[PDB]
């Protein structure tokens, strides 16, 4: 009851979709014998389907008139109604990893800037240095904040610019 | 509701606050001839349509000509008719 969206545990279109997918799979399964390789595969697929539907209905997901789970992007509606694991939690889950990648690459660039040929340390990766930085980039948020507060994350007006500034 | 009373009063109040209250401020603001110079220095007919061809002299001591009168009375008529119209539907929202 957020935007007229019913829970997927209470929606009938959701159960209809589940039984429809299972009917497709068992109509494929009728063609094979008891324990064939295709029969094993289709039974595993049916089990995965039932598990997926149970696990989406168990996760408190909201469904529309089509019986499909709809995600709640808004923090405040996601945190009020228990939908933070849809978009809100994976947001910071992603941002951690993305800042991880960016911070590690940044540290690698800054570390290889000192060498005589910094370009050949970019087509030929310094793997020990890269792995050291990849391991110690797990604390990228704290290090990035502390590099932001020292004024050493940013470059000053030494960057290059076109003639009309 | 006496629309004559309402509109005469609005116009009189606005003319008063234009003559006695906001005349000095309006004269201080309207004196733009500054960095902001005249629109035209030319002598064409279309350059003259932008000059003040007629300075509206007034024997009012504070310098309150027919243009100040027109403006403050227009504001007064507008506000008086707003009062009359908002009273016309016998109420207000809040």
């Amino acid at each position: 009851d957020i935007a007229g969206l019913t829970p997927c545990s209470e929606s009938k279109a959701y159960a209809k979709l589940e039984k429809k997918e299972l009917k497709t799979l068992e109509k494929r399964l009728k063609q094979y014998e008891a324990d064939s390789a295709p029969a094993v595969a289709l039974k595993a697929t049916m089990e995965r389907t039932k598990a997926r539907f149970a696990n989406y209905a168990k996760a408190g997901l909201l469904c529309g008139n089509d019986g499909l789970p709809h995600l709640i992007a808004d923090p405040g509606l996601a945190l009020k109604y228990g939908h933070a694991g849809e978009v809100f939690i994976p947001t910071f889950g992603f941002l951690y990893v993305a800042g991880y990648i960016g911070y590690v690459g940044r540290q690698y660039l800054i570390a290889v800037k000192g060498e005589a040929k910094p370009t050949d340390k970019e087509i030929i990766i310094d793997v020990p240095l890269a792995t050291k930085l990849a391991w110690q980039g797990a604390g990228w948020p704290l290090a990035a904040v502390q590099e932001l507060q020292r004024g050493t994350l940013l470059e000053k007006e030494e960057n290059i610019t076109v003639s009309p500034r | 509701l006496d629309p004559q009373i309402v509109i005469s009063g609005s116009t009189a109040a606005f003319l008063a606050i234009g003559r006695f209250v906001f005349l000095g401020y309006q004269r201080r603001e309207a004196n733009f001839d500054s960095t902001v110079g005249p629109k035209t220095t030319g002598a064409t007919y279309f350059d003259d349509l932008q000059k003040n061809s007629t300075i509206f002299a007034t024997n009012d001591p504070a310098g309150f000509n027919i243009i100040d009168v027109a403006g403050w009375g227009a504001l007064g008529h507008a506000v008086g008719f707003a009062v009359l119209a908002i009273n016309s539907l016998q109420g207000a929202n809040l």
Binding site: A51, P69, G85 | -
Partner: protein, 41 residues
């Protein structure tokens, strides 16, 4: 084999290895934790 390991440290080889690793990690995560639409565990 210093030169061979220098070759393996080249951008395309390292990219291939790293993306094989990332894709295999994601594939194994999706095999053992199938159909993760939401963070609920």
């Amino acid at each position: 084999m210093k030169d061979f390991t220098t070759y393996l440290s080249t951008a395309p080889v390292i990219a291939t290895i790293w993306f094989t690793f990332t894709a295999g990690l994601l594939i194994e995560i999706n095999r053992y934790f199938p159909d993760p639409l939401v963070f609920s565990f």
